[PDB]
Amino acid sequence: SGEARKQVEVFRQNLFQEAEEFLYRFLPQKIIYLNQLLQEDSLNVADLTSLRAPLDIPIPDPPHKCGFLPGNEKVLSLLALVKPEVWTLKEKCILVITWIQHLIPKIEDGNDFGVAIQEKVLERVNAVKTKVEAFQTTISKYFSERGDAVAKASKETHVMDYRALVHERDEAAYGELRAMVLDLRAFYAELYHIISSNLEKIVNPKGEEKPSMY
């Protein structure tokens, strides 16, 4: 049915216009915004001791449940800034993958080089997708891990390694967040470069139909 082709064609056209716009607007803007978050002193803290957050568990000494132990506030405010960014990149990356997948041509025996340029770009977009998805999992892992340590540390007040673990886990997230904001910034950048450099082959993989030899 021509009408069914038309409905997909409408979606395809919308994706193309969004991809072109995202490439010439959202991707450059994001690179700048992310670089600023990195430049900000909050993600540039010189000494991790400042990030250390109070763990109010009484130690055992020779002659009740601990009071609320809150999450490291500094880390949480940073996480709150990062979580929107992780999702904007994932969604924008997804928009690009669909654009390329739609553009792939009818399978043919040869002149499949343009398809190859599309495949190698897709392989990069896929690699970025796995890395970014993992970033989202890490945020949950931190909360579960920090939580478990806090629970163990209160349950066995005597062991101080558990107390060190809480401080270390917080330290790692600060280090990880710094790397993660760096990676998202880098990823928008790499995506813009692969797509811009190879735009012609990606947009028109097999090219103009060969002049009749038939």
Binding site: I104, I107, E108, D109, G110, N111, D112, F113, V115, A116, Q118, E119, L122, G207, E208, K210, P211, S212, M213
Partner: protein, 241 residues
């Protein structure tokens, strides 16, 4: 879902599942690597124009020769590998001359294209002769001349197929130039309009701003023989744009 195996592309003399003979097709792609050339055939004459693509100021502009004279009646504009063009322009020059010797007459543009085409077709290892290039030729030639049937422009491709074209563009921007040519071309246009139109299209397609040095333009009106506009003449026409 990407199936990019290919594996029938390499090696002429191999037919792909689907019978596509890809090496020849790839050769047709090569002409896109070349500078755009546009030819308009009008009752007044056929005009040929090409973009020189001069790499360095030190290179002498005259040497780049993308428009050449096969004989007074017929001229050729070539886009693609320069070297393989030189062989094809030579077969044409000898064949026009051989016809004068044998028949004391001037070959029609079509016969001359058929003659060069026959050489191009030989790439298939059609003949047993050792001195035939195995690769399909990588050049596309636009041959325009005034013959018994009047102004005619024939386009030849690496496959060796030739066809008369009222207007054709061969080269990097051929797609798009052809589209523009389709809109501008009207059979009645005089050569003066065509020269202006072709140069307008070239200015749009060419990356550099048009200057007398960057373009080569030729005409073969029926009374006159192949004429290449000199820098002074080119300057006058470009100024009009």
């Amino acid at each position: 879902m990407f199936l990019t195996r290919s594996e029938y592309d390499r090696g002429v003399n191999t037919f792909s599942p689907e019978g596509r003979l890809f090496q020849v097709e790839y050769a047709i792609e090569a002409i896109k690597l070349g500078s755009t050339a546009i030819g308009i055939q009008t009752s007044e004459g056929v005009c040929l124009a090409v973009e020189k693509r001069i790499t360095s100021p030190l290179m002498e502009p005259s040497s780049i020769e993308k428009i050449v004279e096969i004989d007074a009646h017929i001229g050729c504009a070539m886009s693609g590998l320069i070297a393989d063009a030189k062989t094809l322009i030579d077969k044409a020059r000898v064949e026009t001359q051989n016809h004068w010797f044998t028949y004391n007459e001037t070959m029609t543009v079509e016969s001359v294209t058929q003659a060069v085409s026959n050489l191009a077709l030989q790439f298939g290892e059609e003949d047993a002769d050792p001195g035939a290039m195995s690769r399909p030729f990588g050049v596309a030639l636009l041959f325009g001349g005034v013959d018994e049937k009047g102004p005619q422009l024939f386009h030849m491709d690496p496959s060796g197929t030739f066809v008369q074209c009222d207007a054709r563009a061969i080269g990097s921007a051929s797609e798009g130039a052809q589209s523009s040519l389709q809109e501008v071309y009207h059979k009645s246009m005089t050569l003066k309009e065509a020269i202006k139109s072709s140069l307008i299209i070239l200015k749009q397609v060419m990356e550099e701003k048009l200057n007398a040095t960057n373009i080569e333009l030729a005409t073969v009106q029926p009374g006159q023989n192949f004429h290449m506009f000199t820098k002074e003449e080119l300057e006058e026409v470009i100024k009009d744009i």
